[PDB]
Design a protein around this ligand. Structure first.
Ligand SMILES: *[C@@H]1O[C@H](CO)[C@@H](O)[C@H](O)[C@@H]1O
Ligand SMILES: *[C@@H]1O[C@H](CO)[C@@H](O)[C@H](O)[C@@H]1O
Ligand SMILES: *[C@@H]1O[C@H](CO)[C@@H](O)[C@H](O)[C@@H]1O
Ligand SMILES: *[C@@H]1O[C@H](CO)[C@@H](O)[C@H](O)[C@@H]1O
Ligand SMILES: *[C@@H]1O[C@H](CO)[C@@H](O)[C@H](O)[C@@H]1O
Ligand SMILES: *[C@@H]1O[C@H](CO)[C@@H](O)[C@H](O)[C@@H]1O
Ligand SMILES: *[C@H]1O[C@H](CO)[C@@H](O)[C@H](O)[C@@H]1O
Ligand SMILES: *[C@H]1O[C@H](CO)[C@@H](O)[C@H](O)[C@@H]1O
Ligand SMILES: *[C@H]1O[C@H](CO)[C@@H](O)[C@H](O)[C@@H]1O
Ligand SMILES: *[C@H]1O[C@H](CO)[C@@H](O)[C@H](O)[C@@H]1O
Ligand SMILES: *[C@H]1O[C@H](CO)[C@@H](O)[C@H](O)[C@@H]1O
Ligand SMILES: *[C@H]1O[C@H](CO)[C@@H](O)[C@H](O)[C@@H]1O
Ligand SMILES: *[C@H]1O[C@H](CO)[C@@H](O)[C@H](O)[C@@H]1O
Ligand SMILES: *[C@H]1O[C@H](CO)[C@@H](O)[C@H](O)[C@@H]1O
Ligand SMILES: *[C@H]1O[C@H](CO)[C@@H](O)[C@H](O)[C@@H]1O
Ligand SMILES: *[C@H]1O[C@H](CO)[C@@H](O)[C@H](O)[C@@H]1O
Ligand SMILES: *[C@H]1O[C@H](CO)[C@@H](O)[C@H](O)[C@@H]1O
Ligand SMILES: *[C@H]1O[C@H](CO)[C@@H](O)[C@H](O)[C@@H]1O
Ligand SMILES: [Ca+2]
Ligand SMILES: [Ca+2]
Ligand SMILES: [Ca+2]
Ligand SMILES: [Ca+2]
Ligand SMILES: [Ca+2]
Ligand SMILES: [Ca+2]
Ligand SMILES: [Ca+2]
Ligand SMILES: [Ca+2]
Ligand SMILES: [Ca+2]
Ligand SMILES: [Ca+2]
Ligand SMILES: [Ca+2]
Ligand SMILES: [Ca+2]
Ligand SMILES: [Ca+2]
Ligand SMILES: [Ca+2]
Ligand SMILES: [Ca+2]
Ligand SMILES: [Ca+2]
Ligand SMILES: [Ca+2]
Ligand SMILES: [Ca+2]
Ligand SMILES: [Ca+2]
Ligand SMILES: [Ca+2]
Ligand SMILES: [Ca+2]
Ligand SMILES: [Ca+2]
Ligand SMILES: [Ca+2]
Ligand SMILES: [Ca+2]
Ligand SMILES: [Mn+2]
Ligand SMILES: [Mn+2]
Lengths: 440, 532
């Protein structure tokens, strides 16, 4: 029927007890002596005795400072009973709503939040999420209005303001540029939650950013000037091993070295990387024939399996490479000498001067012409200038030693330098007739 | 039903209006939109709009500041009506009691209170009763608790404060003593009524108490000593007028004077009171006497018509009454002198000395006797010693003016005082009978018969008194026998009977008593020829 508006008593109302709330009355209180009582939880049921009525007057009282976190609304019930025991009124519902108070400082879901970010992080980029919770009601007051701030970064370098937390989501982001893993790879932050939109109760926690690796460090030679040498006509010959220091995380693609010869037109050099140390093993891809080039002054540059991040400004070494002239065999020119000679050729006369080229350009080398393969003893080559003279009577009809009207004999031009390199040339002595004979 | 307790608002609340009293709800408020309204005296009925209710919230609130003296209780009613016009609930009586505030100074039922007290009443005695009345809440506050106090008495004497008031009764009574009708006949009081038991709002009225009269003042003789002269045998003659002064209410019994002579044993003097002047005129109730008392010195006191009040010490004055001696007529001693004297008394012989006393005792009085009345002139008196000798022959049987046995003279005794005073005695001179007379026959010219005579009585006369009269004896020396016979008819000699013995003349006849003879010559009796 007619009732009583919901009552409000502030949480933790402190002062003297007990306090009045509102008195109730039955219009039947002059019909008979009526006796009031209140029931429900908070009254007779737990928490028993927080609220009470004066049986005589019907005054409802609260006994103690309320706590809404504990219990934010009591549902009580009043009764009117005559003195002769008959219940007079159908019980009236009485609702007490305890109102809120900033009596609950905020608190982080975690003692310590931890996250990570790229070394080369784009300011305003997002790292981490920090959170906290207040126990009053944000539905009705700013007492659960949590406002995150940051109050300390360790280390406070390069700046003191590397990151920031979104005031009212808790999301931590990159504020500035300068996160170098190579420099400060972990950042410890004390993050603060405060209720009353930061104005009220402050509770602090921790958030740790390990800034991680990013190929942001070119490999470096030491020094830029190397120096060595190769047997000129050798292949797979180590020229020199060159040293570099990638500052990035070790053993990571962003660390291991890729070398490249920039000035190698002939594809005659190869520098392979030594896994364990990523040194530059400078070899030869093709045996360097000395005479054309006495020295190679070439550069070699460094990289990483992992492509460089951003601008690329790669380091370069200079290996002033020296080849050494090795004594090679001289080359009969031509190697297949064919000449026609009348079988009736004079004994002791010159046939022809068969010669050889000198490959090693020592302006100081000589050649010795001899002959071994004289099947039938007719020839005798001048040891000095390759001159050939018959020292016996030739005959084209001379069978066996004359294959097919042609007589083959092997000549030699031995060398005069380091090792004894004996060039070999061939004379085809073609004897045409001068009955076993040939027409006419 | 579950009602709402009575709300109480302290009258004349000063705050920011309007002010919320309570907030009502109909539980049906959620099954339909309900609209709250109140009605009644202060709501819709005058006073109007004193109390209001917000329709959506059902907040009771007040608009004015209430006044308890005006409206002390508000009875209101709440109404719930859905947004569809259907009255959702039953009207709820809402009762509002206005609490009180001390905001009504009391006020004396009378601008001025009259009163009366008797002169010299006892300290503690009750004179009158004043009153005031407060408009505030006497059932529940001292706001109506009055304390009567006296502010000022007029005048401030004999004492600064003659009367006190019964703090909370209004009664005014005689604090101390000295209340005099004769000094200050009325007092005026400024009495006060302050509430909160006397510490609150005061207000003030007048109280006028007249001190009344009592016979507290004795009447006093203006002059203490007096004097007066009065003649000697006059009655009620002013001798003096007694002057007295009484301070009490004029023309009241507590003022009227009453005069009493102390020296009043025989009651000779009376003193009456002049209605208006109240003076004490002194008369005499009886004729004074000079020869007895020279002069009277009497005390007369004056007390008052009504009994005095208390120490009663009456005032007396002392009047000396000089009596006036007046010449009083002399007294014969006795006034009626009787003397036996014989009829024979010689001419110049002195009968007696008849003398009067002088009543006046101033020795200048000369009593001078002169004879007043004697129709026979048998008498003569000495002007000096008042002796009365005879001057002629006296007769006991001079029947003309000796009516009885006695002759009666009148003597008077004058004097020579201021006025002339005279006394009067009467000489009762009895004359003893003396036989100077002689017997005679009654019928002198008697008459007889010549033929047959009848008998004739002859009366005998004799003026004297026995024994000079009765035993009469008669004879005839001259003749008789010649036809004469006398018999004393009566056994005792009264008279006799005479008659012829045989069948004119003059007979001589002797008579006597105690031997006093007288032959009576006249017996001229004619004898004539009759039959009888
Ligand atoms: C920053 O924002 C990113 C989204 O780009 C989240 O993954 C991270 O949890 C932090 O809130
Ligand atoms: C909150 O911050 C304080 C510094 O005032 C620390 O001592 C604590 O560990 C928490 O992180
Ligand atoms: C060193 O290497 C760079 C690239 O890293 C070359 O561009 C430069 O010419 C030098 O040889
Ligand atoms: C050879 O060395 C020179 C410096 O001496 C560099 O300029 C060049 O890049 C190469 O490494
Ligand atoms: C004035 O006095 C009268 C009695 O004379 C009372 O009736 C009244 O209460 C007031 O005190
Ligand atoms: C007293 O009386 C006699 C007369 O009886 C006068 O003579 C005298 O004058 C006085 O009146
Ligand atoms: C803090 O933020 C977290 C999100 O990670 C929520 O789940 C939590 O309720 C609190 O608001
Ligand atoms: C043999 O002859 C040749 C001619 O081509 C020369 O080049 C060589 O020096 C040798 O004398
Ligand atoms: C060429 O042949 C000669 C023989 O004359 C050797 O002495 C030399 O070692 C090379 O094999
Ligand atoms: C010339 O070449 C021959 C083979 O063709 C060898 O036998 C000789 O030693 C020289 O080198
Ligand atoms: C001369 O020619 C002969 C071929 O008949 C080769 O055997 C020799 O090596 C040289 O070149
Ligand atoms: C005191 O008492 C007397 C009588 O006892 C009254 O006459 C007077 O008015 C006052 O009340
Ligand atoms: C009471 O006394 C006051 C003075 O305070 C007067 O003004 C008033 O007339 C009454 O007598
Ligand atoms: C005057 O004197 C007389 C006595 O002579 C008293 O009787 C009276 O009372 C008054 O004092
Ligand atoms: C008359 O005079 C006498 C003196 O003899 C007083 O005693 C009395 O009081 C009155 O004054
Ligand atoms: C008459 O007057 C004389 C005075 O001379 C007296 O002696 C006599 O007693 C009578 O009173
Ligand atoms: C005595 O009386 C006689 C009259 O009987 C007067 O004459 C005389 O004056 C006196 O009063
Ligand atoms: C003497 O007495 C006679 C009476 O017998 C009077 O008449 C006379 O006045 C005088 O007193
Ligand atoms: Ca709490
Ligand atoms: Ca709270
Ligand atoms: Ca809080
Ligand atoms: Ca870096
Ligand atoms: Ca890196
Ligand atoms: Ca790198
Ligand atoms: Ca070469
Ligand atoms: Ca050579
Ligand atoms: Ca060479
Ligand atoms: Ca031949
Ligand atoms: Ca031939
Ligand atoms: Ca031939
Ligand atoms: Ca009022
Ligand atoms: Ca009042
Ligand atoms: Ca008052
Ligand atoms: Ca007096
Ligand atoms: Ca008097
Ligand atoms: Ca008097
Ligand atoms: Ca006298
Ligand atoms: Ca005289
Ligand atoms: Ca006299
Ligand atoms: Ca005579
Ligand atoms: Ca005689
Ligand atoms: Ca005689
Ligand atoms: Mn409260
Ligand atoms: Mn109020």
């Amino acid at each position: 029927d007619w009732v009583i508006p919901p009552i409000s008593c502030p949480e933790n109302e402190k002062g003297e007890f007990p306090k009045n709330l509102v008195q109730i009355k039955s219009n039947r209180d002059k019909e008979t002596k009526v006796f009031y009582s209140i029931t429900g939880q908070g009254a007779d049921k737990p928490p028993v005795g927080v609220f009470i009525i004066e049986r005589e007057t019907g005054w409802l009282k609260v006994t103690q400072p309320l706590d809404r976190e504990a219990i934010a609304k009591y549902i009580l019930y009043s009764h009117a009973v005559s003195s002769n025991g008959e219940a007079v009124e159908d019980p009236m519902e009485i609702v007490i709503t305890v109102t809120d108070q900033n009596d609950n400082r905020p608190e982080f879901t975690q003692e310590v939040f931890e996250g990570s970010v790229a070394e080369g992080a784009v300011p305003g980029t997002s790292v981490m999420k920090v959170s906290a919770t207040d126990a009053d009601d944000d539905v009705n007051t700013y007492n659960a209005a949590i406002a995150y701030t940051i109050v300390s970064q360790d280390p406070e370098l390069p700046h003191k303001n590397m990151f920031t937390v979104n005031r009212d989501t808790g999301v931590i982001s990159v504020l500035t540029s300068g996160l170098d893993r190579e420099s400060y790879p972990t950042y410890t932050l004390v993050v603060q939650a405060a209720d009353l939109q930061g104005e009220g109760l402050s509770t602090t926690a921790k958030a740790v950013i390990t800034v991680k690796d990013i190929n942001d460090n070119a490999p470096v030679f030491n020094p830029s000037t190397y120096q060595g040498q190769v047997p000129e006509n050798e292949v797979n010959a180590r020229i020199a091993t060159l040293k570099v220091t990638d500052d990035d995380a070790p053993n990571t693609p962003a660390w291991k070295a890729v070398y490249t010869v920039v000035n190698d037109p002939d594809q005659q050099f190869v520098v392979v990387t030594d896994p364990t140390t990523n040194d530059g093993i400078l070899k030869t891809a093709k045996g360097l024939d000395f005479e054309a080039k006495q020295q190679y002054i070439l550069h070699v540059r460094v990289e990483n399996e992992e492509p460089f991040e951003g601008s690329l400004v790669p380091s370069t070494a200079t290996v002033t490479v020296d080849v050494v002239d090795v004594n090679e065999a001289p080359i009969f020119m031509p190697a297949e000498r064919r000449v026609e000679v009348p079988e009736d050729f004079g004994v002791g006369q010159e046939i022809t001067s068969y010669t050889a080229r000198e490959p090693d350009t020592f302006m100081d080398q000589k050649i010795t012409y001899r002959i071994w393969r004289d099947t039938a003893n007719w020839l005798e080559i001048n040891p000095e200038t390759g001159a050939i003279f018959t020292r016996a009577e030739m005959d084209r009809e001379d069978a066996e030693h004359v294959k097919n009207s042609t007589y083959v004999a092997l000549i030699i031009a031995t060398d005069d330098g380091s090792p004894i390199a004996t060039g070999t040339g061939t004379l085809l002595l073609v004897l045409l007739d001068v009955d076993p004979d040939l027409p006419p």
